[PDB]
Amino acid sequence: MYIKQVIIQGFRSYRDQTIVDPFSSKHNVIVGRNGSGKSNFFYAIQFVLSDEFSHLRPEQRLALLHEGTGPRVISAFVEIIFDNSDNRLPIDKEEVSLRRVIGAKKDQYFLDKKMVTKNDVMNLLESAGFSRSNPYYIVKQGKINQMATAPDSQRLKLLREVAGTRVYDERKEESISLMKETEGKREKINELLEELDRGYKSIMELMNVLELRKYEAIQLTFKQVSKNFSEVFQKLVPGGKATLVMKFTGVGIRVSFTGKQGEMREMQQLSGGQKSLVALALIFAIQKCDPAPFYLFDQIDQALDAQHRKAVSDMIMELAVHAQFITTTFRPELLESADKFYGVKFRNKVSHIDVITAEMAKDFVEDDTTHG
């Protein structure tokens, strides 16, 4: 929505409090040593606003405590303060606050220091515009590549459940499943010869009218995520003409940019110099088509080179007006397009939070000042 600041107490690597400069308007960067705690911040956000890290049996959640410089702490605190500059929150609150304490068994919640439990926090989250079913824009480490090396199947499911109709293909085939082996029942009666024949017609009619809106709803986002994809890719690449195509049937991703000779191939049979582009492009297609309160990126600059950094930073510096984008960097080109800069250090088995200035960001992470 509009993130102000966070407070962390003993979550995974921060045994101390995390009162720092509030996060800026559009975009901020995170720099530091490998394993400093940058990713831990993002799992902290995901934990405080998603159940994927809080729905398991109560064994690993204890390892979701902080065990750096001493014994296990029985209680840890996570909270996030926002600023309702857009009147997004249904409740009339100027500074939106979410909070959870994790303990041996306690994982209750506090909205603006108000006692709230499980269901009465997801209800407001769904009224707050969040996709629990598929965690969009909390893309974690290794995402840009996991969707990349794999076939049309996982991109099909990625798009179709970021739309989200999982129950529909869980029961449509089950309705189909019984219609296959029961064909002998009709034919045996057909050999014997009654209402079931028009019933079989009724089966087809009801199934068709059921499927009418399901795939239509997919097209209610498919064509949107397709048209902007070509637009956003053309924005990224001056020759960019990557598109989506339709065929239950499959889909197809295709890419075209600056070649105009023979470079119309599918990214599955393509090398790694474009997979990250296709990923980021589809995330920005969702960005434009399906706006979200904020946007959280991890290692989105893992594979390509600085040539891609120049264009992506140039585009993001202007796309920041849509909403707040948050990512982690290790290089200064994309670091130069952030409203404020933040960093994570590590001392005595405990992470240390500190808002890094421009003069300290563009010299410490550029020149290798490693040790050990």
């Binding site: 490998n34 394993g35 090398s271 594979a303 992470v365 290798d368 050990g372």
Partner: protein
């Protein structure tokens, strides 16, 4: 042995009969995104008898310059490599294709599959070794999967995994033989030792090696590698856990392990499988993938003073502090035309002060 000259004909972004070389002990290469640099590694892997079934090719027809668009430059395209080592054998290997048919050549003569094997394991590399063959994101791939697949891949490397699919069907029926037989049991420990002395021999070796490998990468005492077997009598029947203790942490399972360290663990595992029957040359691409500049210098020094005894190294990298110190900076650059083409040019960082 040291590699000197490489000749390529009609591959992806490779039009022309370019000869490439010579090479050195630790040669680094850098270039733009999609510059055919990974296709160099593809050529190196293919010329040494690749499966030719997992290289963006249907069977043999999509492995040609502009092939999976419908415009192959020709029906034939091939590599030849010059392998020079001790014994005064400056020989050459060659992999050629015509149509959907492929052919092997040792010093320009007809060579078939099993003869290629009997001359290939002569070089010390198994037909199913594939140990040092890197990928663009190989070090981001092995860690994520469950330990059982790592056990399978580490048992298939010792001429052992090819009979697991028949060993597994042995046990569950022999209880009936127990229920009433003894001749089969007295012959049943034969296959048992065929598993044990064939797999555990390299297993203990790599388990010992990973310690000093991780040390050489980091020189941190608390940072320790631990390949912990479960039920060591039948370890490959289940998963074998791994614990790469970082310098600032303790013994922790694979569940809550930070991602930014899986790269170092994967590289250490690569050098560990190298320790088992090493290959005389290395290929590396995108070493600055997920490892930050903190450990990049340590890793780069580790290789470039680690590959000075019997095996050479080829590496692709991006971070500044690596090519602050390397000794070769060869490059491949793209160019337009009817399709994409690439051309090879050679500078060595040794001349660079």
């Amino acid at each position: 042995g040291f590699l000197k000259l490489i000749e390529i004909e009609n591959f992806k972004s490779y039009k022309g009969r370019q000869i490439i070389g010579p090479f050195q002990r630790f040669t680094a290469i850098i270039g733009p995104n999609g510059s055919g640099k990974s296709n160099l590694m593809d050529a190196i892997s293919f010329v040494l008898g690749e499966k030719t079934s997992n290289l963006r090719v249907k069977t043999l027809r999509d492995l040609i310059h502009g092939a999976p668009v419908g415009k192959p430059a020709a029906n034939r395209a091939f590599v030849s490599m010059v392998y020079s080592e001790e014994g005064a054998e400056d020989r050459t290997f060659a992999r050629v294709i015509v149509g959907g048919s492929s052919e092997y050549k040792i010093n320009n003569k007809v060579v078939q599959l099993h003869e290629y094997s009997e001359e290939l394991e002569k070089l010390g590399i198994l037909i199913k070794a594939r140990n040092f063959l890197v990928f663009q994101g190989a070090v981001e791939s092995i860690a994520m999967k469950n330990p059982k697949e790592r056990t399978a891949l580490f048992e298939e490397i010792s001429r052992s995994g090819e009979l697991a699919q028949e060993y597994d069907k042995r046990k569950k029926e022999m209880v009936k033989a127990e229920e009433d037989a003894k001749k089969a049991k007295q012959a049943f420990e034969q296959i048992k030792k065929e598993r044990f002395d064939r797999f555990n021999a390299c297993f203990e070796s790599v388990a010992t090696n990973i310690d000093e490998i991780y040390k050489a990468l980091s020189r941190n005492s608390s940072a320790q590698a631990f390949l912990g077997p479960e039920n060591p009598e039948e370890p490959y029947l289940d998963g074998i856990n791994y614990n790469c203790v970082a310098p600032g942490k303790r013994f922790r399972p694979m569940d809550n392990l930070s991602g930014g360290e899986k790269t170092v663990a994967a590289l250490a595992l690569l050098f560990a499988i190298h320790s088992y029957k090493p290959a005389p040359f290395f290929v590396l691409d995108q070493i600055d993938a997920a490892l930050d500049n903190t450990n990049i210098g340590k890793v780069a020094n580790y290789i470039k003073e680690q590959s000075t005894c019997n095996f050479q190294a080829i590496v692709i990298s991006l971070k500044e502090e690596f090519y602050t110190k390397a000794e070769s900076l060869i490059g491949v650059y793209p160019e337009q035309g009817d399709c994409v083409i690439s051309k090879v040019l050679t500078f060595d960082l040794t001349k660079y002060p």
